Amino acid sequence: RSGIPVAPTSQQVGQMYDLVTPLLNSVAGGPCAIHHGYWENDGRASWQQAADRLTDLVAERTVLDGGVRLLDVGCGTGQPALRVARDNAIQITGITVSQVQVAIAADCARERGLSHRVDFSCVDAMSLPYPDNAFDAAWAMQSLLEMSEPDRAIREILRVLKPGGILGVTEVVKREAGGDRWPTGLRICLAEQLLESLRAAGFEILDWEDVSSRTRYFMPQFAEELAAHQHGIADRYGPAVAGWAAAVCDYEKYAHDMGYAILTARKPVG
Ligand SMILES: Nc1ncnc2c1ncn2[C@@H]1O[C@H](CSCC[C@H](N)C(=O)O)[C@@H](O)[C@H]1O
């Protein structure tokens, strides 16, 4: 029944990422995935490696052939798009509200020799410039819950997908109804609420996988990485970034209530 509970504007979100990007890159050792890792065992792989696994799982579910056009909704620094573009002859349109991320993503594309397959733009997902029925597939890897009006973005994605087009969504969720923003600033949402918003917009749900048991290593491991780079965060990156950093390192107060969802949905055929 209930959908995504519904905040910062898209410009404000872009600004926050403009500010925090250099810190994330520093922690990661370069432009990085900005999503949780997925582990096969008891947390052995680095979070970067585990994040690449998540990317690969999403690509498996969404890139069904060569020669398709894919919209990466909230593309971060473009690292996941470029990972997939290395080995898939497809066209990815990556959109983000952060001009810092656009610039980094486009440079990375150039450096890697992948700009024939991937391009990046500063575009608000709540208002897409694209015609109806433009894309074979889409990703929203931890982007929908950052939006002021996620339902609006979901309807736009449905609009610009072709009939039968596939959407893959990942998100940090409240694992279960037992026991509103997380201390990191992320909107609190159940996977069940995300599903209901997708359905309500007109998507067919193909699959939901609750993978909370595979991703639980992320917050502790990323916090430890962050803590190494924590000196002078407030003076070097600004107080907003310092507040966010403090929240991540405070993960023991809340992360046990978090889980993770991989959703596959499609625009009805026609
Ligand atoms: N309204 C909006 N329109 C487009 N992108 C948005 C948006 N609100 C937030 N985002 C983007 O969503 C991303 C969240 S971080 C996820 C990044 C990427 N999908 C990854 O997996 O690495 C950021 O790039 C942020 O700028």
Please characterize this protein's 3D structure.
This is Methyltransferase-like protein. It comes from Saccharopolyspora spinosa. Pfam families: Methyltransf_11. By secondary structure, this protein is an alpha/beta fold. The chain is built from 10 helices and 7 strands. Strands 3-2-1-4-5-7-6 form a 7-stranded mixed β-sheet. It starts with 9 loop residues before the first helix and ends with a strand. It has a single domain, classed as Vaccinia Virus protein VP39 (Rossmann fold, 3-Layer(aba) Sandwich), CATH 3.40.50.150. The longest helix is centred in the first third of the chain and has 19 residues.
Which H/E pattern describes the elements?
HHEHEHEEHEHEHHHHE
Helix- and strand-based class? alpha/beta
Tally of individual domains: 1
**Which small-molecule species are bound to the chains here?**
S-adenosyl-L-homocysteine
Beta-strand residue fraction: 15-25%
Radius of gyration: 17 Å
Could you give me the name of the CATH homologous superfamily?
A: Vaccinia Virus protein VP39
Shape: globular
Task: Give the CATH topology.
Answer: Rossmann fold
Helix content: 40-55%
Biggest beta sheet attributes: 7 strands, mixed
Count of alpha and pi helical runs = 10
**In what order do the strands lie side by side in the largest sheet?**
3-2-1-4-5-7-6
Distance between the termini: 27 Å
Oligomer: monomer
Pfam family, one: Methyltransf_11
GO biological process, one term: methylation
GO molecular function: S-adenosylmethionine-dependent methyltransferase activity
Protein name: Methyltransferase-like protein
